Amino acid sequence: GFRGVEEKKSLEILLKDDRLDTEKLCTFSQRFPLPSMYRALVWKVLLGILPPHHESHAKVMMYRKEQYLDVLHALKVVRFVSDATPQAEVYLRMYQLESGKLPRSPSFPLEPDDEVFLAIAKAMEEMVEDSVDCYWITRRFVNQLNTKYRDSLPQLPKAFEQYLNLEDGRLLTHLRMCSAAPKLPYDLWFKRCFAGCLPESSLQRVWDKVVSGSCKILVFVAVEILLTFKIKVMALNSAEKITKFLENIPQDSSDAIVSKAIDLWHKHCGTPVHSS
Amino acid sequence: QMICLLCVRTASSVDIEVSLQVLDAVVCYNCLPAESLPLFIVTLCRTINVKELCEPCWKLMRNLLGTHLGHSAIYNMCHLMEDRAYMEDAPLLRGAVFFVGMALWGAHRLYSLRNSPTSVLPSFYQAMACPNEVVSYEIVLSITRLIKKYRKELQVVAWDILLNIIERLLQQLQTLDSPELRTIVHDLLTTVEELCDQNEFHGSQER
């Protein structure tokens, strides 16, 4: 079955309209993966980097590029960044400047928020080719974590504890016998949004859903992580060993991890339905 | 260093008065060593909270800021307001707020200091990182002076930082429940409104 063709053509129809319906684009992003050629466009549109009207994209990208170059040149002028500075750290400093949270000098150690943004920025670099697009996608994504999900993300660990049992109760019982449930890497999974845990070629399938309003996809991604590694987790026998394994999971099974996490999230939270 | 540690450690306050006099001698007729500047500044921020010694302490700080170490001292006092090791040191934060504000927009402004208020107000905001009635009272008094005097001079960026400060003050009033702070914050809002009426307010009226 050529369902990939159906998905791509439906998205091209959603993108053909002179006004892009962000609600339909969100529902599509929930229900299907984004083709890689339209992922940056659709992420820009849902993150509000580009407005719904397609005509306005040229001028708004001029605005975004001007803002990016102005902030970057300013960081160069106050010597906060340099040409050697990694692109992710450049994005971190640009975000700090734009949010008014720039330190006095780059030698000031990173705050936890800074490391979280840096991790998401590193992951974005591999997903988005263009530096301006990558920076804007990164900043809007992290801002969604701090604004659209400031209350939802803290609930995610409990949702993990719930759905983990609901798919294999004995597995969560195995974890709680180790009393390792509060020591699982929730800051990685839900503040850094699996940046640095999954390869970006499949972390992007997660982030399609995170952009389109779903941070529970993160819960199900973690759940499918532990379901995929049942053979290993049921052989794990210590809280610290579990914590270290979960921060460095084998990356080979990650494509299937995210695919089955999306399947699980479509099974437990239902299939998205187009509005009438 | 020895006189500053005296001021920090002394039980007697006349000792602090003559210490401020000796430091005035060091600042005026000699050179304050640039490496003694942070401890000197911390000492004055501590001393400016003693009621009987504010006038000598402010005169000493003004004389120091009249030397070549003035911009360095303003930057150090903003560093004190921003450093996390001093979040709980309320008297020192209050003193730094008082000093930076009095030097840059007080009646005793040093017109030798080239710094716009924009450069130091983020430090005022960070001085309120840990809620403290007296620190916020000094913040709002200093900002009241800055606004009531330099409303025309205050451009949009200065008003951004001032509105962020007023927002953090209004947050604190949900928890400090202090009537003197509440009164001057709401008077400050009323003056900002009057500046909107006179069209001398250049900030974001939306915010």
């Binding site: 102005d70 300013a74 002028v77 106050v78 010597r79 | 451009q155 949009v156 960026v157």
Partner: peptide, 26 residues
């Protein structure tokens, strides 16, 4: 909004030239 941006761009340009001069004097 464009004029606001251009005016603030010029203000930052003056400060940028001041910063480059002050750094040059270091």
């Amino acid at each position: 909004a464009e004029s606001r941006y251009e005016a603030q761009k010029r203000i930052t340009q003056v400060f940028e030239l001041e910063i480059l001069d002050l750094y040059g004097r270091l």
